[PDB]
């Protein structure tokens, strides 16, 4: 049951990614965790991501077996991949600065989701909740 409206509750080391990856604050303001909306619209071998925020907006399509894209000179650029194994999804990114590796594993911890991301020395976790 991935396809649905997802609203992040709490986060851990999220700021960590903002520094090591150099993620802007203006965009991170609501994307940090407090006011971040992560939408899931699984479509075939690709999942649509609709992000909702106060004034800012974000979105990124996903495809099992394809690279991630988040190039933003205004904030940061991260390119990786995304794949799902059974009931678990493992996304990834890579910084253009020096091709830094970034890993993310989202598991279904019952009625909630426990996210764990890592990026060269920077590992950030994130507990999820639904609207
Ligand atoms: O959606 C983003 C984003 C990243 C860079 C620029 C613009 C948006 C995001 C925030 C936080 C995170 N992402 C991607 C997965 C997770 C992480 O990095 O670990």
């Amino acid at each position: 049951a991935f396809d649905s409206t997802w609203k992040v509750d709490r986060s851990e080391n999220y700021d960590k990614f903002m520094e090591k990856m150099g993620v802007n604050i203006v965009k991170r303001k609501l994307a940090a965790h407090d006011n971040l909306k992560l939408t899931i619209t699984q479509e075939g071998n690709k999942f649509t991501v609709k992000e909702s925020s106060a004034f800012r907006n974000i979105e990124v399509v996903f495809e099992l077996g394809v690279t991630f894209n988040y190039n933003l000179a205004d904030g940061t650029e991260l390119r990786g991949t995304w794949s799902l194994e059974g009931n678990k999804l493992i996304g990834k990114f890579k910084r253009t600065d020096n091709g830094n590796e970034l890993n993310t594993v989202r598991e279904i911890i019952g009625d909630e989701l426990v996210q764990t991301y890592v990026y060269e020395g920077v590992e950030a976790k994130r507990i999820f909740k639904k609207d």
Side-chain angles (χ1 to χ4, degrees):
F2 262 122
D3 301 64
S4 235
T5 300
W6 289 28
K7 156 230 95 65
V8 87
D9 181 80
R10 52 189 70 84
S11 83
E12 270 263 69
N13 260 346
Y14 192 110
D15 203 14
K16 212 110 207 176
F17 289 36
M18 280 54 247
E19 315 298 76
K20 186 104 208 87
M21 320 186 325
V23 194
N24 162 252
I25 185 159
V26 187
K27 184 243 96 146
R28 186 260 281 201
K29 238 62 143 310
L30 319 181
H33 52 251
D34 43 12
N35 315 87
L36 185 283
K37 166 66 95 206
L38 211 39
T39 304
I40 302 172
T41 338
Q42 311 194 319
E43 244 307 87
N45 45 258
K46 102 85 122 65
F47 301 172
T48 332
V49 189
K50 187 74 174 271
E51 318 213 29
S52 201
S53 243
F55 206 107
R56 226 263 172 290
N57 269 82
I58 325 170
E59 171 125 59
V60 55
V61 11
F62 295 163
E63 205 180 298
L64 307 185
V66 183
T67 275
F68 257 14
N69 276 73
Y70 245 138
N71 285 53
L72 214 81
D74 275 67
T76 191
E77 311 151 310
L78 268 121
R79 313 215 249 79
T81 41
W82 213 81
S83 245
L84 220 134
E85 311 260 271
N87 50 266
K88 305 124 61 69
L89 59 93
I90 326 97
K92 273 117 205 207
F93 286 106
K94 267 266 261 313
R95 261 220 60 161
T96 257
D97 182 279
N98 217 309
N100 289 130
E101 315 160 88
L102 195 139
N103 316 59
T104 175
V105 188
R106 307 192 215 171
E107 331 221 31
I108 320 286
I109 198 52
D111 54 281
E112 296 203 23
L113 269 279
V114 57
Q115 312 143 273
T116 332
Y117 314 65
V118 72
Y119 170 79
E120 324 308 80
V122 170
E123 218 137 11
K125 252 125 294 146
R126 184 135 38 82
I127 325 304
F128 163 80
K129 300 187 179 269
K130 320 183 61 173
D131 205 85

